[PDB]
Amino acid sequence: KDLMSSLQSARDLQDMRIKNKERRHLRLQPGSLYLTKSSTLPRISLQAAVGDRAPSACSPKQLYIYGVSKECINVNSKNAEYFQFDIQDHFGKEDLCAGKGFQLADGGWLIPSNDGKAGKEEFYRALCDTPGVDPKLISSIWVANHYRWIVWKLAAMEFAFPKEFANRCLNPERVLLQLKYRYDVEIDNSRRSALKKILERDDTAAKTLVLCISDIVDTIELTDGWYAVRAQLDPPLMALVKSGKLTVGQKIITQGAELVGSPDACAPLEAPDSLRLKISANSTRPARWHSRLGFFRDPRPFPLPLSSLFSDGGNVGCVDIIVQRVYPLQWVEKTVSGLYIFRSEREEEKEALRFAEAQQKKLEALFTKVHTLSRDVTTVWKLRVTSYKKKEKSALLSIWRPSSDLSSLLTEGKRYRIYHLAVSKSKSKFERPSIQLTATKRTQYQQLPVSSETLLQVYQPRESLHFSRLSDPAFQPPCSEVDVVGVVVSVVKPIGLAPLVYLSDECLNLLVVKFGIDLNEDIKPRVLIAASNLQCQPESTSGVPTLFACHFSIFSASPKEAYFQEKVNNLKHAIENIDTFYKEAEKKLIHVLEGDSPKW
Amino acid sequence: PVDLGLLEEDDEFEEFPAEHVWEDNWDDDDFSNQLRAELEKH
DNA sequence: TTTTTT
């Protein structure tokens, strides 16, 4: 307690040193902490300092014994700037009977403010008067921030980590100590915290970062231990904070975030409301309890599996994959009205030319007047990738404006770390729930090696379906695509479009291939054929199974891909064997086609 | 007992970085229990 | 910037 008498008797005596010492250049003397740490003395990791043990006070642990202190517990990230210690609970009656108050380490004097409270203000001054401390380079707020943080940290410490800590941290000495610490760092040597270093457009923006969520619904606060900005959250982060799967004091680590707001040389923390730290889900994630806020040792993008990833949650700074299947190109037109049109090559050659012929018709007519506009088409390459080691829903990654050599660079059955890919929803009759990998100008690729056995586990090269299988209802193959070889037995192509082609194998099993495009030609019966990339489909011609022919589909009368031959020349056998095959075929179709016993 | 100043605070940083860590799937030990947050739960 | 079939 004491009496207000012998109070301004150091308060109005304190200001003296402020002035009188601010009338010169001071002698910056390193504080306690700073020196200790600087020493040759062996140091400790919270990790070890707790015995590879992590927090065990789940919503109030029954054993307040250790050192309770209901004067902290009721502290939370928000009420850390407030607080103020009670000079009566942490003392007794010692050096409080005189007219001095309390001198708390490192030097300098704290003026146990009137009512019996010592908080924010006090220490600021009780700092200004501290050795080597030049209150000419600081404020009562700059110390309102650092006060807050520190407190909060400490508080915790006791909590979750008692059998090692207690009220050994709530000592304004301890406290005022780091308070000084800070000085010797942020000022004395001028080593800026992460945030402060970035909110000052001085060090590479939001690349790698581990931060702790400081406050809360429109948006939230993140701190690097020194300062806190407000983050800009995306749809699924929101959905977390909303669900409570992310709460203040939890540590996250983000990647390639971005600085929205004040694109100007922004002063250390304490700026507008326009600024914000934009962080995207697919670029950030939960961090281990310790982890050390701030930047981060290895900046080189951390790989994630596709298994996670949100449509709505930004770019995947990086994925390490294996390229299951690679595909045939595509040409896409943005019809004036907006709509898109996908076109095969030998199918955007046709239309390709169609235009040309009419473009031509235009000029012809332009001059039959002077004498007597273009097409928004672009190219795209799509391939099927998968997160490396494990199982997943495969991902469709699409590189626009592909590139001459690149066809021969990313191949099937190879491993890649693809850096920087935008992520979007699936939307494609053929894959509905999944996500889309779309390369950007940013993107870059790395081919990493793979073990013959780790290979055969993840992968699945292409192989020519057996036919048989297709009847069976137990054939739930990969995403539904298949490749095949057979001989053409009949080509029904009714007007009311969508031709069918029946092929049969050497054993006379048939299937029909509904065509979504125009018949590659060469497709006359009795012809050896090799389809690639056919979609699967329920059934069709009462009895015989179907397969749809895509923009991505392929056919050939002379295949080079090895995976066919084992079945091609296997087919060549019956083919060449006789002709009574090209004939046994009909029999069957007709037979199937008309059923066991029709009106003979 | 445990010193309290040689202990590397989960925040004392180094000038420039050169002088596992993240949980794979978002929603789904060292991750679940954040110190600073155990506080608000109590 | 991302689409189809008796």
Side-chain angles (χ1 to χ4, degrees), chain A residues 1-58 60 64-69 72-216 218-599, chain B residues 1-18 21-28 30-40:
Chain A
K1 190 71 170 63
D2 195 355
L3 196 61
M4 326 289 245
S5 304
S6 27
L7 266 202
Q8 191 175 61
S9 75
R11 169 183 275 75
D12 227 295
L13 166 56
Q14 195 171 63
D15 306 299
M16 177 277 266
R17 284 153 292 179
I18 298 181
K19 289 273 279 289
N20 288 54
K21 282 198 174 181
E22 66 168 284
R23 297 182 70 279
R24 330 171 292 160
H25 70 303
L26 293 190
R27 192 56 284 285
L28 299 82
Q29 280 181 290
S32 168
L33 286 175
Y34 188 110
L35 296 169
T36 274
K37 315 254 182 178
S38 300
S39 69
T40 302
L41 298 218
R43 318 214 42 190
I44 312 71
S45 60
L46 321 82
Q47 260 283 277
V50 179
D52 195 300
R53 187 53 280 168
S56 283
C58 279
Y64 311 60
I65 313 172
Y66 310 80
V68 193
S69 309
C72 79
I73 290 186
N74 269 271
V75 65
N76 308 307
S77 46
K78 301 170 185 176
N79 56 296
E81 174 183 295
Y82 287 132
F83 190 47
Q84 300 197 81
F85 310 69
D86 4 298
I87 27 172
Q88 174 179 170
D89 281 284
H90 291 304
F91 302 89
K93 192 70 65 193
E94 53 184 63
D95 331 313
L96 172 63
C97 273
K100 275 305 170 184
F102 295 117
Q103 181 194 60
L104 301 172
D106 202 341
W109 279 92
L110 177 65
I111 312 179
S113 197
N114 322 298
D115 302 278
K117 303 188 188 81
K120 181 184 170 184
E121 306 274 301
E122 301 89 314
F123 301 68
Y124 163 44
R125 297 277 193 187
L127 153 58
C128 303
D129 62 355
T130 305
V133 180
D134 175 1
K136 179 195 298 183
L137 289 306
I138 99 174
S139 49
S140 167
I141 42 180
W142 176 115
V143 187
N145 140 292
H146 294 300
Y147 176 62
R148 190 191 170 195
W149 293 150
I150 302 183
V151 173
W152 187 35
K153 141 162 51 176
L154 319 158
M157 300 264 52
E158 192 205 83
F159 214 161
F161 285 145
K163 178 182 183 177
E164 293 110 355
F165 295 74
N167 29 300
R168 321 171 39 180
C169 313
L170 305 67
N171 298 57
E173 39 180 285
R174 189 105 290 294
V175 186
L176 190 69
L177 258 183
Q178 285 202 55
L179 278 129
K180 205 299 182 184
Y181 184 7
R182 306 254 164 165
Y183 177 72
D184 320 72
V185 222
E186 172 191 335
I187 321 289
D188 279 5
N189 297 283
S190 200
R191 272 152 53 192
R192 296 127 298 194
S193 90
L195 299 202
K196 184 173 178 179
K197 190 167 164 70
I198 202 172
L199 267 198
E200 271 188 357
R201 303 274 175 167
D202 279 358
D203 200 67
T204 294
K207 45 178 175 185
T208 26
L209 239 87
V210 189
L211 320 192
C212 191
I213 51 186
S214 148
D215 204 8
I216 303 291
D218 296 348
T219 43
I220 52 79
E221 205 169 359
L222 301 185
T223 156
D224 73 325
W226 296 66
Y227 309 107
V229 321
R230 320 108 305 167
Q232 178 51 84
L233 287 229
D234 67 36
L237 294 186
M238 295 310 308
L240 285 170
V241 170
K242 286 191 76 71
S243 48
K245 306 313 169 187
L246 217 128
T247 143
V248 182
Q250 297 205 195
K251 298 148 163 284
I252 66 173
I253 163 189
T254 80
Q255 248 198 292
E258 189 170 358
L259 191 38
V260 186
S262 68
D264 47 72
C266 187
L269 205 289
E270 302 314 351
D273 299 295
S274 77
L275 202 160
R276 239 98 176 170
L277 199 52
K278 185 183 174 185
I279 55 176
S280 294
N282 294 340
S283 285
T284 74
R285 258 156 183 55
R288 326 213 80 133
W289 79 264
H290 33 304
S291 290
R292 295 192 205 165
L293 315 199
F295 271 4
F296 184 90
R297 56 179 178 303
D298 189 314
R300 189 68 81 173
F302 64 106
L304 287 57
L306 310 167
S307 300
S308 48
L309 291 170
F310 300 122
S311 1
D312 30 22
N315 318 50
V316 175
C318 153
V319 306
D320 157 296
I321 80 233
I322 209 317
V323 171
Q324 230 201 296
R325 279 48 189 303
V326 105
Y327 293 141
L329 226 175
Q330 296 275 283
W331 279 263
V332 188
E333 209 188 310
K334 288 181 190 174
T335 75
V336 306
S337 45
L339 290 179
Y340 294 73
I341 281 170
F342 268 84
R343 295 255 173 47
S344 151
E345 184 207 54
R346 182 91 75 171
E347 175 187 37
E348 139 67 27
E349 199 156 57
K350 192 191 189 71
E351 168 67 38
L353 154 166
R354 194 231 65 173
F355 191 74
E357 286 185 314
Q359 253 302 280
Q360 221 276 292
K361 277 282 178 182
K362 179 145 296 190
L363 170 71
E364 291 237 290
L366 235 194
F367 34 61
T368 291
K369 176 304 193 70
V370 143
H371 281 79
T372 158
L373 186 165
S374 188
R375 231 155 58 91
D376 216 348
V377 135
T378 161
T379 173
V380 231
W381 195 29
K382 279 164 165 282
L383 10 63
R384 208 167 218 63
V385 280
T386 51
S387 295
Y388 196 171
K389 281 176 184 171
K390 64 191 74 58
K391 287 180 183 176
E392 27 54 53
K393 52 182 172 187
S394 356
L396 219 34
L397 153 82
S398 3
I399 308 175
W400 294 90
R401 295 163 201 59
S403 179
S404 307
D405 287 296
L406 195 161
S407 304
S408 58
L409 293 197
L410 317 210
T411 87
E412 306 201 314
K414 295 319 191 70
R415 196 201 166 186
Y416 299 95
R417 231 165 181 76
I418 315 300
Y419 300 129
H420 305 272
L421 308 192
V423 192
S424 11
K425 196 175 293 182
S426 181
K427 62 163 63 177
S428 182
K429 183 180 300 180
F430 295 146
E431 285 153 65
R432 291 170 153 301
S434 280
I435 57 104
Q436 192 156 273
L437 262 0
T438 329
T440 66
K441 45 182 171 63
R442 305 258 50 175
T443 321
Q444 210 161 346
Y445 325 71
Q446 183 77 47
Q447 203 194 179
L448 311 176
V450 186
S451 52
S452 313
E453 301 77 63
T454 299
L455 192 75
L456 280 60
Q457 269 296 75
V458 284
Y459 192 60
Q460 222 300 60
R462 290 190 181 281
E463 192 163 5
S464 180
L465 195 166
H466 277 300
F467 268 88
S468 321
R469 288 187 197 147
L470 275 155
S471 63
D472 190 333
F475 199 64
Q476 285 187 293
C479 36
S480 307
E481 312 169 3
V482 347
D483 293 294
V484 282
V485 176
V487 60
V488 182
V489 337
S490 179
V491 182
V492 167
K493 57 160 69 176
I495 294 183
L497 307 185
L500 293 47
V501 167
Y502 292 73
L503 322 99
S504 145
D505 51 10
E506 74 272 43
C507 288
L508 282 58
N509 311 296
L510 321 303
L511 75 191
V512 248
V513 175
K514 230 175 292 189
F515 274 61
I517 62 165
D518 293 8
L519 276 125
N520 277 44
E521 199 27 55
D522 310 52
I523 295 180
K524 296 189 169 184
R526 321 165 72 71
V527 150
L528 182 66
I529 282 307
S532 337
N533 289 116
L534 287 87
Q535 217 68 1
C536 256
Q537 299 236 340
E539 70 309 67
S540 191
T541 301
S542 52
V544 47
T546 328
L547 294 190
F548 171 110
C550 195
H551 267 291
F552 284 110
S553 268
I554 292 292
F555 298 85
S556 182
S558 172
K560 315 303 175 185
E561 296 81 352
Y563 70 113
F564 285 118
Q565 269 77 294
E566 179 174 356
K567 193 72 145 53
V568 143
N569 56 188
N570 202 182
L571 186 73
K572 205 64 177 182
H573 279 306
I575 299 173
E576 56 196 349
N577 178 216
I578 339 119
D579 162 305
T580 68
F581 171 42
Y582 306 110
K583 221 296 158 53
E584 205 67 49
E586 297 231 315
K587 232 295 219 61
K588 171 88 94 163
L589 196 330
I590 320 187
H591 179 51
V592 153
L593 229 206
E594 74 182 300
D596 285 299
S597 61
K599 297 196 163 187
Chain B
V2 177
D3 174 63
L4 317 76
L6 289 185
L7 160 69
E8 290 150 313
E9 288 290 349
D10 71 278
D11 87 59
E12 32 180 283
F13 56 76
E14 287 291 59
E15 185 66 287
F16 56 82
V21 200
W22 17 276
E23 183 174 32
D24 260 357
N25 304 68
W26 212 297
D27 195 303
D28 73 318
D30 288 67
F31 285 112
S32 32
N33 311 279
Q34 292 306 95
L35 93 183
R36 208 103 36 144
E38 275 279 65
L39 203 178
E40 272 75 356

